[model samples]
Target: GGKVQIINKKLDLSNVQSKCGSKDNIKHVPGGGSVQIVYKPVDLSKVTSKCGSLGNIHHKPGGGQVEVKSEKLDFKDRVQSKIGSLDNITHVPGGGNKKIETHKLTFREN
Candidate 1:
């Protein structure tokens, strides 16, 4: 017999760029620096308890650094995230280097 299963959702950001005075304040900088991608897993027991038995939820927390080089500095840092069957997850500043301000991310499920 097979049982119903629930999988977590994933988000993907294609060409995630920052805007002036926006969440991603990369534009605020003169050189138009780059931003790091950070991610973590959040507790979702409450949701699963309320809804039903959530399928095997697995989370792979990891992140990397990104840099952009330009002369005119006409581009913003575009950060993106993709969630998987990990149920629930959270993304935040990775390294304690620069502070991430205004930013946006797209969510998608496979």
Candidate 2:
């Protein structure tokens, strides 16, 4: 556990502190660090297929007859997409080393 204090222009790290425990790793400076998520192959595959219901409707009124036959629409195709996982996780400043203490702050990624 740790504490995040906000007292001035930037978040004051004067009281923020924590110990590196099992699998804990610090990898960035609070303000200038960055991370990015990337997707491999970069293509979202789409599939198109026919969509609609089929039925027959008939009605008779005033001795007149009317009939309607409902069928699948030929023009519409439902589109579907697929995606993959996050292929990479990386930070800008540190490479899985470094800890925060005494006015310095960086979050640990478990």
Candidate 3:
């Protein structure tokens, strides 16, 4: 067995603000309130069982709510996987973006 490294490098969400207006309407804590999340990397092996050869993983960072969705994996099942949940995931002022970093597990044949 071997391991794989999946680096988000940059979870850019700067474009979201331009597309979905602003979140100024929403209510937040003092200091504008920043959000963050820690999600367990998805086990590609286990996901392939039901989702097939992982098509694509998507990450959308915006102001209002932090939305994370993926294709191939079942909607319900997706939430149960390692990356299903989120951590330290939140929004920031200046309409910027966030970043997520993690590692993945892989297999190799001898």
Candidate 4:
């Protein structure tokens, strides 16, 4: 499993051409300046991607506080990407049902 951490930067993950390892924790934060990396986890079961899953993710909390958010997620059909531009979370690209837990994740301007 791998962990992806971005701090104080503008992350542009419009197109995730690469794949994160497994159980990768993608985090984003604009601490220093702006322009950082956005992590997109892929479901190895559904599609052919490198990213394994989104186990732990956070974006909107804005603080390093400990928080927990959970829900059952379903991939539905395929692992779709944002394509042009988007913000960034836990994802199930394969199918079935799994307990998706995360923190404060914001998909908008923060």
Candidate 5:
């Protein structure tokens, strides 16, 4: 029952507050168009079953593709899993925890 807030020019929290034990904790930045999500490994026994102890999440605002690489499958599974999907979590070989690519994403109501 905590909202992850990142304070900046102004104070704002609760972006991911709607989650009832869901994954993808979001901290919104002031003045918009960007967001940071924090994913932490959980101990299911410590959380409620309504939460699955296994959480899933879905976020919006953009539609683009990117290649994410990691050296370990455990690292890869955490990313692909938290994205709220039970299938095809794809990744390939760029072996370091450094920047692979960057893109500026904008938002508007369709």
Candidate 6:
């Protein structure tokens, strides 16, 4: 049986790197130039009280982080691609109130 259930979504940014400003910043430092990745509240969207019957959703929250030595990338583009420009995790199949039924997930995004 397949029931259309709702779920809660959360986000996180892993392996994030901090950007260096001026020579004085890392200059006066003792060892090799290194910075901490300050985690800031991300401005992303997620489902809340929309619809879910279980403890959590069957979808994975998307977030991205980069290495200082790696090539720079557009922060938004990274996350957008990681999350797949669509509503992949919004709805899922599960057993819930009433009989379970086959459902089709036909959602799109950009």
Evaluated with lDDT, which candidate comes out highest? 4
| TM accuracy, model 6 | 0.11
Clashing pairs in 5: none
lDDT of 3 by residue, 1-110 (tens): 34555656645433212334333554333332334333334544331123213454444444764454545854343223345666665455564475644343355857
Which ranges in model 2 have alpha carbons more than 4 Å from their true place?
Answer: 1-66, 73-86, 95-110
| Alpha-carbon local distance difference test for all models | 0.43, 0.44, 0.43, 0.54, 0.46, 0.42
Residue pairs whose backbone atoms clash in candidate 4:
8-29, 8-30, 8-31, 9-30, 9-34, 9-35, 10-34, 10-35, 10-36
Give lDDT tens digits, candidate 1, residues 1-110.
Answer: 45556566784434433443333422222222334533333332331112333344335434663343544523355678665644323477567766555545455756
What TM-score fits each model?
Answer: 0.13, 0.14, 0.12, 0.15, 0.12, 0.11
- Local accuracy of candidate 6 as per-residue lDDT tens digits, 23-95: 3433222323223333434433543332323454434445665222564535453222234354325365676
lDDT of 1: 0.43
* 1 versus 5: better TM-score goes to: 1
Better of 3 and 6 by lDDT: 3
lDDT of 4 by residue, 26-108 (tens): 56555443354344455546455544345656555575556646557764544445557655544578877677755645577
Clashes of each: 16, 0, 8, 9, 0, 2
True lDDT of residue 60, candidate 2: 32
lDDT of 2 by residue, 5-107 (tens): 5455644333333552334453333433334323232333444333343354334334544453555634444556465654544345846777644445565
TM-score of 2: 0.14
Runs in model 3 lying further than 4 Å from the true structure: 1-34, 46-72, 75-110
RMSD of 1: 26.8
